[PDB]
Design a protein around this ligand. Structure first.
Ligand SMILES: *[C@@H]1O[C@H](CO)[C@@H](O[C@@H]2O[C@H](CO)[C@@H](O[C@@H]3O[C@H](CO[C@H]4O[C@H](CO)[C@@H](O)[C@H](O)[C@@H]4O)[C@@H](O)[C@H](O[C@H]4O[C@H](CO)[C@@H](O)[C@H](O)[C@@H]4O)[C@@H]3O)[C@H](O)[C@H]2NC(C)=O)[C@H](O)[C@H]1NC(C)=O
Ligand SMILES: *[C@@H]1O[C@H](CO)[C@@H](O[C@@H]2O[C@H](CO)[C@@H](O[C@@H]3O[C@H](CO[C@H]4O[C@H](CO)[C@@H](O)[C@H](O)[C@@H]4O)[C@@H](O)[C@H](O[C@H]4O[C@H](CO)[C@@H](O)[C@H](O)[C@@H]4O)[C@@H]3O)[C@H](O)[C@H]2NC(C)=O)[C@H](O)[C@H]1NC(C)=O
Ligand SMILES: *[C@@H]1O[C@H](CO)[C@@H](O[C@@H]2O[C@H](CO)[C@@H](O[C@@H]3O[C@H](CO[C@H]4O[C@H](CO)[C@@H](O)[C@H](O)[C@@H]4O)[C@@H](O)[C@H](O[C@H]4O[C@H](CO)[C@@H](O)[C@H](O)[C@@H]4O)[C@@H]3O)[C@H](O)[C@H]2NC(C)=O)[C@H](O)[C@H]1NC(C)=O
Ligand SMILES: CN[C@H]1CC[C@@H](c2ccc(Cl)c(Cl)c2)c2ccccc21
Ligand SMILES: CN[C@H]1CC[C@@H](c2ccc(Cl)c(Cl)c2)c2ccccc21
Ligand SMILES: CN[C@H]1CC[C@@H](c2ccc(Cl)c(Cl)c2)c2ccccc21
Ligand SMILES: *[C@@H]1O[C@H](CO)[C@@H](O)[C@H](O)[C@H]1NC(C)=O
Ligand SMILES: *[C@@H]1O[C@H](CO)[C@@H](O)[C@H](O)[C@H]1NC(C)=O
Ligand SMILES: *[C@@H]1O[C@H](CO)[C@@H](O)[C@H](O)[C@H]1NC(C)=O
Ligand SMILES: *[C@@H]1O[C@H](CO)[C@@H](O)[C@H](O)[C@H]1NC(C)=O
Ligand SMILES: *[C@@H]1O[C@H](CO)[C@@H](O)[C@H](O)[C@H]1NC(C)=O
Ligand SMILES: *[C@@H]1O[C@H](CO)[C@@H](O)[C@H](O)[C@H]1NC(C)=O
Ligand SMILES: *[C@@H]1O[C@H](CO)[C@@H](O)[C@H](O)[C@H]1NC(C)=O
Ligand SMILES: *[C@@H]1O[C@H](CO)[C@@H](O)[C@H](O)[C@H]1NC(C)=O
Ligand SMILES: *[C@@H]1O[C@H](CO)[C@@H](O)[C@H](O)[C@H]1NC(C)=O
Ligand SMILES: *[C@@H]1O[C@H](CO)[C@@H](O)[C@H](O)[C@H]1NC(C)=O
Ligand SMILES: *[C@@H]1O[C@H](CO)[C@@H](O)[C@H](O)[C@H]1NC(C)=O
Ligand SMILES: *[C@@H]1O[C@H](CO)[C@@H](O)[C@H](O)[C@H]1NC(C)=O
Lengths: 131, 253, 131, 253, 131, 253
């Protein structure tokens, strides 16, 4: 299902801030004692509305709220950090949680290059049928 | 089910992990991301009178917090120090590890009083109060936040200035709320919804440089008369006035 | 291993309470400010002892306690929420943590329908052996 | 290893994730569930004297909490307000986000005193104290709990009334513990293990409607003599008596 | 990449302590009320420097610190317990997050024993070509 | 990216999960392990003067904690009770569930004063303070820790004595720090970096059995003159002296 932005306005540019789980630290800057304070750990960027992704993202966050709020109502965790990890697990369970029937629609196994490994090397037996 | 954003046919689609096809490839948890988007970017009114009417107090509902990894630079953030008339705090202290929203052009710091008929202050439209990479359902005392919402995404494989604007408030949370913009500890301006942040800052500079502050031990409250203009979204967009005095009220034209 | 209930008694009916991570909210009821209090988020149901599942479940919970208590003794987490997610991971690692040898006992790949895709389409070459 | 319940051949089996066969399909974390089952359902005695003897105080063992997603309606729950003789609290306040067990027909609220020779109160049989979707190894002060245990399952792909019963206790936790059922703040009944909840409620109503409460500033303690019957599990199951007085003790027949 | 210990010294023996998520408890010792205190839950062992693993492990922990500290700087979790579970997920996503092209380098599917199930049972058709 | 240790060709390699080949088999989360290794095992000086110079106070950086499952028996651990001159605590109380490091031959308990110009005490070399299976970036008050670092591993498919040594300190955290080894509450020895734990314990026993403790209400500080030897790593390795007195200072030869 596609995203239809139905907001009164859309800021088509996303001036964003975020962190970095890595970042080749300069010298001692990775050491907490020497590194930046809480205010200085952020990187910034600017993203424009190519393919309408920014205005679609604003609508997506809007529409996500009901399901997210209902999830938070039902959990007893005070702070929830596991949403994305659980969706990664559900990704794998959906594709690999049962028996993978090759050539079936729910099995992500491609026997392409090795359909062409048997049917090519049948011409080693029907090829050499000589005596 | 919590929806997931994914890029398909040069467009963002709402999908889920159980609805992807085999060509869709998720080879790393690095492809999964959470973003906080500010209500600002949807065109909501950001003035203090309009913004505070979106929040209300409620008991019986435990607060909930969810993390988000990336956010949007905010033009307007808010920081509340509200007490009851008896002096008790209306809002709880920020829990350990919850810091203010990191990018705010204008921080509207509102101090004042109200009934606060509820244990926690929630967003009446179901949005979140965004802090430093943590989104909460409730407002924490003296902690800068932006109103916003959270989205979850599957990505494909392949200067900072901040100004604090201070307000005094009475009857906070009710439909009879009065707001004053603070010039100094004794000079104030009656706040109206139409006043933009830059108008308040230039009205503040004009009052200082025209010498229109209180030169008394008492409190001086200016009123900007309907004559003068102030206001359009922030991303797509005062020299000399008259001041005469009329708890000392006054008018500016 | 099957479950043998060895308790003094068994209540064969399970009058249960639980929550709901979704639930098509009516109007504004998904908004925390307007929604139910902590006491009003529960749904109820009644489950009977068909296939002996209820009396078996009571014994299962009883027998689970020792392993659960020993797990809790060893963890430094104050509140444990990750047991079921970790078992989902261990499910996938058991079946897909190594090389899947097709037709082997530990490989959940079924080449059934496409055993019948080659052996059917051998009758495109041994079929047409004419000149 | 923590065992897992699974349905096979029309029966519940204890298995684990590493012991399943390829036909067993786990396509969603929604198939994995945790359940709290009450000791009530196994036939344990639920009267306050019997129930409290299953709990004891112990130092040196850090408390532990585990969540569970679904629970069972309880007929008997407990809520403890125990102090030492010197007035200090025996039990810790409930941690943030730990609420009482949500479905209790009878809440046995016990207030009183005891030695409490230990930092935390544990279950002597290794069971858990079930709260609102959180199971703890220890008892929290003034927080309603049911005794129970937790099970973990793999599922296949395809009115509420509550009554609080109040007790006073001395020598709590020892083998010399005395319990009194509270009719009002000055009228009490000596508690015995055989008294069921409904007997206590009807004995309470009889005392009120027969006017057998204390009409003095002093404390009146009734004793039900061995004559009278009271008691069988709760799921498979008083008009006029004599009252004469004998710290004022008395007897009921 | 191999580990080069570049420390001033190396203690080649690892006198270690740890816990146990199980341990067949003796009688009632699994019950928290009766079991060991916090000081008595540990087991001990001694590991020597065979294959240079101990001196390599000391260098590995040393070199891990920068990436670990930078990860901790970026997270808002007060206590992090999910590092190893996330790496288990990333293991599965790397191998099974996309379509598995059989005989390809990134597909851990071995069709060995059943390459020898077709090429053996071709001698049921080319075998019996008699009339 | 956080590196992972793996055994290949009879040797430990640093790899990652995305860099393994198909022959590498991870069939259980039990194969993934975290270990804390002590800086001791790398040859760092473990005396109190040298060890404390590796720690410093800093504000603006939130503390962070990560768990580790197995640790190494430590010869030297540390336990700090530092206050400011005005009497306020320099270090925060240990958070709930953070206990001392479980295996320490010698616990160097340092009490004293310093400026403590910072909200938290960090490790200047980026190492961690190891507690009971929790590694922190900061030091907690009165909580025994070992300095160390954490490694993460993929495994293949297939008596305890502790002695507390007490010190007094002034000017803690600066480059003008003075340390005294505590014999009793009134007898002390000027501490030098060369003093090993066993030398301190035998110097302590000698002072007790030679009767060289203070027999006054006042404070007696001994100095060991450069004559005497004390000191090599701990894993690869006093009868009668002269005592004359010279706030009462003295010398030992
Ligand atoms: C996702 O995006 C959508 C679209 O932008 C947002 O939709 C908004 O939803 C809220 C409800 O939560 C709407 O607020 C309601 O507006 C009603 C109409 O407001 C005025 O409308 C016009 C002027 O604009 C006038 O004709 C009219 O008379 C009103 O002056 C109000 O009637 C509502 O107020 C009443 O109900 C509320 C409870 O909802 C009470 O608190 C009030 O006291 C009062 O009784 C209410 O304010 C809002 O209008 C919607 N906007 C749009 C553009 O449709 C979602 O909120 C957003 N989701 C998230 C999570 O942010
Ligand atoms: C899973 O389900 C099983 C079965 O229902 C439960 O098993 C119970 O285990 C507990 C031990 O934890 C047992 O309690 C012990 O009972 C002994 C016998 O009690 C009486 O037995 C008969 C009357 O019924 C008399 O002949 C006898 O004299 C006793 O009067 C007691 O001797 C024990 O008390 C002594 O040891 C304890 C420590 O265990 C001390 O605290 C006491 O002071 C005393 O010295 C003890 O009480 C219980 O009997 C078992 N029940 C059954 C039906 O077998 C598991 O508990 C359950 N698991 C969980 C986690 O709930
Ligand atoms: C992983 O393992 C490596 C190797 O063991 C460790 O490397 C150490 O890194 C620290 C830096 O964090 C080094 O400490 C620095 O040492 C410099 C030299 O110290 C002396 O060196 C010799 C005597 O040994 C003399 O010639 C010299 O004059 C010094 O007396 C110092 O100059 C540094 O101090 C200055 O900078 C620091 C900030 O770094 C300030 O705090 C000081 O005030 C001062 O201005 C500093 O002390 C250390 O030498 C390295 N050791 C080795 C053997 O190379 C890593 O630390 C380790 N990783 C972890 C996480 O433990
Ligand atoms: C550096 N990556 C940033 C920039 C863009 C921004 C982003 C990324 C992908 C998309 Cl499709 C969009 Cl609309 C926006 C984002 C979101 C979550 C986490 C990080 C980031
Ligand atoms: C709505 N699902 C409820 C009802 C039954 C109950 C349940 C489900 C499956 C089984 Cl086999 C059993 Cl014995 C009992 C349960 C358990 C955990 C979480 C939820 C639920
Ligand atoms: C019982 N297992 C212990 C002993 C060895 C120790 C260990 C295990 C494997 C290796 Cl390769 C090394 Cl160098 C060291 C360890 C590490 C983490 C968790 C537990 C353990
Ligand atoms: C608004 O306040 C007015 C007072 O002018 C009062 O009549 C009423 O209680 C309030 N109305 C609403 C809808 O809150
Ligand atoms: C203004 O008032 C506030 C609050 O009473 C006080 O903290 C501040 O110091 C005052 N500033 C001046 C300049 O008087
Ligand atoms: C108002 O103007 C004065 C004069 O420079 C300045 O010091 C003060 O910071 C201004 N207030 C705000 C909120 O910008
Ligand atoms: C004294 O205060 C008034 C405001 O009450 C202000 O307008 C005036 O400029 C001040 N006096 C002078 C000389 O500036
Ligand atoms: C029970 O209390 C009695 C007092 O009657 C005393 O002899 C003993 O200490 C207690 N016995 C047990 C087994 O706890
Ligand atoms: C009974 O006593 C309790 C505790 O002392 C008190 O809180 C309560 O108000 C009293 N109730 C009556 C009716 O006296
Ligand atoms: C006892 O009876 C009185 C009389 O109606 C009632 O008010 C009270 O709630 C009863 N107590 C309990 C515990 O039910
Ligand atoms: C006075 O109190 C007694 C109990 O001590 C009670 O039985 C009696 O009914 C009361 N008096 C009246 C007239 O009811
Ligand atoms: C060390 O302390 C000395 C005092 O002798 C002083 O000169 C200086 O501030 C300090 N030097 C350093 C490098 O910290
Ligand atoms: C030594 O001093 C400490 C701290 O003042 C005190 O707690 C301890 O009891 C004293 N011990 C003796 C033997 O005086
Ligand atoms: C010092 O020696 C005395 C004499 O036996 C002993 O009691 C004390 O514990 C010793 N101190 C230390 C730190 O070992
Ligand atoms: C009295 O104290 C001194 C230390 O000041 C000590 O050396 C001496 O042995 C003590 N006296 C006796 C008789 O031991």
């Amino acid at each position: 299902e596609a995203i239809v932005n139905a907001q009164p306005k859309c800021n088509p540019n996303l001036h964003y801030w975020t962190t970095q789980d890595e970042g080749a630290a300069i010298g001692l800057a990775w050491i907490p004692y020497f590194g930046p304070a809480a205010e200085g750990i952020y990187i910034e960027g600017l993203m424009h509305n190519q393919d309408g992704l920014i205005c679609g993202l604003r609508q997506l966050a809007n529409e996500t709220t009901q399901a997210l709020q209902l999830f938070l109502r039902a959990t007893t965790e005070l702070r929830t950090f596991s949403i994305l990890n659980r969706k990664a697990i559900d990704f794998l369970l959906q594709r690999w949680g049962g028996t993978c029937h090759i050539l079936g629609p729910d099995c992500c196994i491609e026997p392409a290059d090795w359909t062409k490994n048997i049917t090519d090397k049948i011409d080693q037996i029907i090829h050499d049928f000589v005596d | 089910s919590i929806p997931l954003g994914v890029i398909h046919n040069s467009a963002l689609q709402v999908s889920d992990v159980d609805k992807l096809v085999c060509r869709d490839k998720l080879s790393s948890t690095n492809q999964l991301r959470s973003v906080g988007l500010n209500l600002e970017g949807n065109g909501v009114a950001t003035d203090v009178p309009s913004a505070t009417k979106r929040w209300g107090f409620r008991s019986g509902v435990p607060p909930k917090v969810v993390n988000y990894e990336a956010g949007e630079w905010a033009e307007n953030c808010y920081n509340l120090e509200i007490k009851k008339p008896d002096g008790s705090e209306c809002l709880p202290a920020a829990p350990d590890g919850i810091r203010g929203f990191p990018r705010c052009r204008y921080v509207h710091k509102v101090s004042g009083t109200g009934p606060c008929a509820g244990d926690f202050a929630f967003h009446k439209e179901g949005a979140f109060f965004l802090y430093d990479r943590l989104a909460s359902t409730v407002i924490y005392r003296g902690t800068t936040f932006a109103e916003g919402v959270v989205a979850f995404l599957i990505l494909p494989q392949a200067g900072y200035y901040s100004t604090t604007i201070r307000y005094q408030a009475t009857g906070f949370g009710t439909n009879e709320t009065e707001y004053l913009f603070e010039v100094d500890n004794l000079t104030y301006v009656q706040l109206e919804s139409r006043f933009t942040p830059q108008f308040l800052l230039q009205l503040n500079e004009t009052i200082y440089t025209s010498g229109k502050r209180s030169n008394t031990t008492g409190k001086l409250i200016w009123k900007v008369n309907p004559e003068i203009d102030t206001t359009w979204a922030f991303w797509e967009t005062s020299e000399e006035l008259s001041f005469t005095v009329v708890x000392x009220x006054x008018x500016x034209x």
